[PDB]
Amino acid sequence: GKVKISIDPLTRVEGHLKIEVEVKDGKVVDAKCSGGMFRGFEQILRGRDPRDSSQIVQRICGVCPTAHCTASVMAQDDAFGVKVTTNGRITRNLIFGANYLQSHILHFYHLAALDYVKGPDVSPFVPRYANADLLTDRIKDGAKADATNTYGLNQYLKALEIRRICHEMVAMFGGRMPHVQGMVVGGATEIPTADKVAEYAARFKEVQKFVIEEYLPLIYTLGSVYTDLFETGIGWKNVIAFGVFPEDDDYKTFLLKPGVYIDGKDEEFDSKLVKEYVGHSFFDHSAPGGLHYSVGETNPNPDKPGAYSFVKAPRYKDKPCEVGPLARMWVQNPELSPVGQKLLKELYGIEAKNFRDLGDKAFSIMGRHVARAEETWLTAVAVEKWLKQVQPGAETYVKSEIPDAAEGTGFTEAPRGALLHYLKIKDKKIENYQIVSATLWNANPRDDMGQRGPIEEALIGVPVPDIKNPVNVGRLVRSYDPXLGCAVH
Amino acid sequence: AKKAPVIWVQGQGCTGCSVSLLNAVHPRIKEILLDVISLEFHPTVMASEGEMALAHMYEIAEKFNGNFFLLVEGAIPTAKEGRYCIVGETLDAKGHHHEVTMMELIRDLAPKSLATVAVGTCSAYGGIPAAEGNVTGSKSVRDFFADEKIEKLLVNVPGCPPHPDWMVGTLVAAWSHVLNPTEHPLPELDDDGRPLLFFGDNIHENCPYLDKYDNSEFAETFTKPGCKAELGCKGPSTYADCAKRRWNNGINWCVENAVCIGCVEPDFPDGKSPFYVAE
Ligand code: SF4
Ligand code: SF4
Ligand code: SF4
Ligand code: FCO
Numbered sequence: 001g002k003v004k005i006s007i008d009p010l011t012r013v014e015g016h017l018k019i020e021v022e023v024k025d026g027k028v029v030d031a032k033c034s035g036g037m038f039r040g041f042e043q044i045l046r047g048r049d050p051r052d053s054s055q056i057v058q059r060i061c062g063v064c065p066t067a068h069c070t071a072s073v074m075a076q077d078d079a080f081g082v083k084v085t086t087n088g089r090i091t092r093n094l095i096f097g098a099n100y101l102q103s104h105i106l107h108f109y110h111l112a113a114l115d116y117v118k119g120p121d122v123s124p125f126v127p128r129y130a131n132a133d134l135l136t137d138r139i140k141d142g143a144k145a146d147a148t149n150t151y152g153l154n155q156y157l158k159a160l161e162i163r164r165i166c167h168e169m170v171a172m173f174g175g176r177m178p179h180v181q182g183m184v185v186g187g188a189t190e191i192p193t194a195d196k197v198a199e200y201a202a203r204f205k206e207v208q209k210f211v212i213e214e215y216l217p218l219i220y221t222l223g224s225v226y227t228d229l230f231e232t233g234i235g236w237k238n239v240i241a242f243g244v245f246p247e248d249d250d251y252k253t254f255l256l257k258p259g260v261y262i263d264g265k266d267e268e269f270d271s272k273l274v275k276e277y278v279g280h281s282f283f284d285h286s287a288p289g290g291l292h293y294s295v296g297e298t299n300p301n302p303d304k305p306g307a308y309s310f311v312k313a314p315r316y317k318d319k320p321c322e323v324g325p326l327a328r329m330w331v332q333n334p335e336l337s338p339v340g341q342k343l344l345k346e347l348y349g350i351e352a353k354n355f356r357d358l359g360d361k362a363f364s365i366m367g368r369h370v371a372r373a374e375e376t377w378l379t380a381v382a383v384e385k386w387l388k389q390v391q392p393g394a395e396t397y398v399k400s401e402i403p404d405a406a407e408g409t410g411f412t413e414a415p416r417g418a419l420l421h422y423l424k425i426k427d428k429k430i431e432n433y434q435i436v437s438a439t440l441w442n443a444n445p446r447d448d449m450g451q452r453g454p455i456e457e458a459l460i461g462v463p464v465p466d467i468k469n470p471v472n473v474g475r476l477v478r479s480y481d482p483x484l485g486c487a488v489h
Numbered sequence: 490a491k492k493a494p495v496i497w498v499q500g501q502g503c504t505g506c507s508v509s510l511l512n513a514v515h516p517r518i519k520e521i522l523l524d525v526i527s528l529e530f531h532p533t534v535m536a537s538e539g540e541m542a543l544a545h546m547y548e549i550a551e552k553f554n555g556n557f558f559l560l561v562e563g564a565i566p567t568a569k570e571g572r573y574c575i576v577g578e579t580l581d582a583k584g585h586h587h588e589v590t591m592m593e594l595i596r597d598l599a600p601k602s603l604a605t606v607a608v609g610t611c612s613a614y615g616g617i618p619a620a621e622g623n624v625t626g627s628k629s630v631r632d633f634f635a636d637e638k639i640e641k642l643l644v645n646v647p648g649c650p651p652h653p654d655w656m657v658g659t660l661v662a663a664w665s666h667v668l669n670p671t672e673h674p675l676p677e678l679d680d681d682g683r684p685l686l687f688f689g690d691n692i693h694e695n696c697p698y699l700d701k702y703d704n705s706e707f708a709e710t711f712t713k714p715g716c717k718a719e720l721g722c723k724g725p726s727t728y729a730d731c732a733k734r735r736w737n738n739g740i741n742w743c744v745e746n747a748v749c750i751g752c753v754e755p756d757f758p759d760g761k762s763p764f765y766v767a768e
């Protein structure tokens with residue numbers, strides 16, 4: 001009595017995604033995640049001036065280009081042997097942090113929310129699933145249903161302007177957005193002025209007000225209606241984080257620390273243990289057993305028997321691990337926002353001080369949205385601080401020369417999860433460039449040992465009581481905020 | 490107040506053209522969506538998914554045959570029978586599955602369109618996906634149309650990404666033309682099919698640093714005063730109105746901040762590289 005459901009395109013994610021599920025007795029019993037578009041940035045990059053990489057790599061994704069830019073310039077800083085100044089480090093954090101706010105807001109509202117909020121009866125808000133299990137369907141008190149839906153929809157509409165303001169903030173020291181000009185090997189290209197710091201701060205305060213007063217309350221209210229969605233979309237419960245937003249010049253300390261949590265245990269992150277498998281991916285490897293990214297290979301092969309995705313399969317100590325706000329917030333375990341502390345008590349009867357106090361609820365559809373909203377607040381607190389630390393007039397750029405032969409790795413967290421760029425230079429040109437991105441860790445296919453990727457695994461057990469309106473499949477997928485351009489590059 | 494029907498498709502894109510559109514002002518994106526266009530299909534933002542989303546796209550392409558704009562973001566890969574870009578899966582009168590390639594999608598929808606508008610340098614000219622080293626046979630809309638012998642009005646709005654003013658302005662000008670062609674002639678295009686409205690000015694000729702250039706005052710590093718030419722600026726070989734319009738609602742632009750990398754040009758990126766070596 002199994003039924004197959006195939007969804008291609010899985011919309012309201014970035015890029016080209018197919019999801020296939022098998023359903024039996026009203027639940028998903030198997031799943032496959034497929035990325036169907038390839039460009040091959042790692043091939044395109046070969047033979048170029050290594051400095052070009054921080055422009056080229058941004059075109060992997062127009063939603064998170066600052067993350068790729070950050071990883072690339074850090075790889076170049078490492079390979080070129082240059083140390084960034086205090087003000088360069090802070091300026092880079094302000095450019096990138098403004099897009100963290102943009103990206104999370106864009107995701108929750110403009111990608112995720114139409115699985116819960118009933119939009120107006122015009123395209124692109126319709127057509128939609130006939131039985132979409134929306135706020136207007138769930139809340140049985142009709143006036144409350146209308147009021148809650150209108151509250152959510154008005155925030156969706158307002159968030160269009162708030163996310164645009166976040167890009168003004170990125171452009172302030174980044175030049176433009178998408179695709180900044182302001183981050184380069186050696187630091188940042190424009191020293192902040194007092195006036196431009198004040199202009200960034202004024203916009204930031206408007207974004208921060210929306211985050212605290214509108215976005216956080218909506219997420220906690222939404223979860224209080226969809227309590228069943230804290231109880232499914234579980235997955236491996238293994239998470240990894242690389243560290244993001246260095247808070248000191250030697251990159252010893254971060255806003256959100258590196259770490260791994262596997263099978264209920266915390267451990268340190270050791271980059272030596274990252275490798276990629278391709279048994280079910282459209283790629284050829286010169287040797288068996290998975291490849292560490294420092295010897296990564298990008299030899300596309302769409303004819304590879306048994307393969308089903310252009311996404312490779314990264315594993316840590318041979319374990320699938322997921323990434324993103326859930327991962328970072330779980331690893332760091334920061335104190336929850338005052339709004340979260342209050343609304344968890346008021347709306348759920350939950351006493352919670354720190355993220356891990358959510359317990360099992362963290363590893364779920366709604367847990368992922370909560371983690372993302374809380375991280376948006378946490379990032380806003382950091383930006384507010386960085387705006388006080390940044391020094392008008394202080395040098396942000398240090399000169400460098402392209403080395404003949406070198407290697408460097410830039411580690412960061414994209415809004416969607418752990419990100420590194422590995423750069424090898426020979427004869428002053430890119431010899432190899434290997435990208436291990438965020439959605440790569442989430443939306444990957446089975447490895448050579450048949451272990452499902454995190455999204456594939458998290459789909460197992462998701463309820464599908466109505467096969468013609470399988471809304472929880474998309475809800476699970478979108479809770480991960482996938483970017484398939486990043487996943488495949 | 491009839492809105493322009495739009496089907497927005499993505500090939501080998503990064504969604505940056507879409508994101509840049511979301512940054513529009515005067516009008517902003519809310520008014521664009523509710524008042525200016527009917528965005529019928531767009532994979533990043535639309536409510537429906539899978540079968541329902543594709544069925545809706547095809548229904549609109551039929552009902553609005555010869556009366557919708559096909560907006561294309563990203564390049565079209567032709568190697569390996571188009572299999573480097575699968576845009577969806579269709580189901581027959583029987584129950585079987587068929588993948589749809591970017592090639593197949595464009596070949597299908599372009600002849601149904603009123604006009605095709607290639608937004609971004611990828612779709613207009615090939616861009617980064619078509620750059621040296623790629624193995625996907627990545628192609629622009631104009632080249633794919635030429636190979637396919639498709640004659641359909643085509644307008645290119647390049648940039649990586651294009652400014653929202655360029656995309657909105659071009660689309661509004663095209664729609665105005667359709668509604669009243671003699672009152673609103675189509676924007677004059679250059680040899681590369683992009684409107685002179687936005688791409689007629691040379692950046693360098695219009696640059697506020699031109700006085701410094703003329704006096705040989707060149708910035709020694711990014712954070713020193715002077716013209717950016719020695720840092721790699723491609724303003725001299727680039728045609729766009731960025732010096733006037735600036736970016737992100739007038740907040741900054743590439744040349745003030747750093748350098749122009751020639752992102753609107755048909756030879757971007759290879760003809761504009763290395764980015765940090767002077768022209
Ligand atoms: S033109 Fe540039 S911004 Fe637009 S899809 Fe291509 S890479 Fe992305
Ligand atoms: S080289 Fe660049 S910075 Fe200098 S005048 Fe020309 S466009 Fe302006
Ligand atoms: S200034 Fe140059 S790189 Fe920047 S948007 Fe304009 S054409 Fe593109
Ligand atoms: N955030 C983001 Fe994009 C993804 N996944 C990257 O890296």
Ligand SMILES: [Ca+2]
Binds near residue numbers: 302572
């Ligand atoms: Ca195939």
Ligand SMILES: [Ca+2]
Binds near residue numbers: 312435436437
């Ligand atoms: Ca890779």
Ligand SMILES: [Ca+2]
Binds near residue numbers: 637638639
């Ligand atoms: Ca033909």
Ligand SMILES: [Cl-]
Binds near residue numbers: 512513514736739
């Ligand atoms: Cl703008």
Ligand code: NI
Binds near residue numbers: 014
């Ligand atoms: Ni992205």
Ligand SMILES: [S]
Binds near residue numbers: 064066103415
């Ligand atoms: S980002």
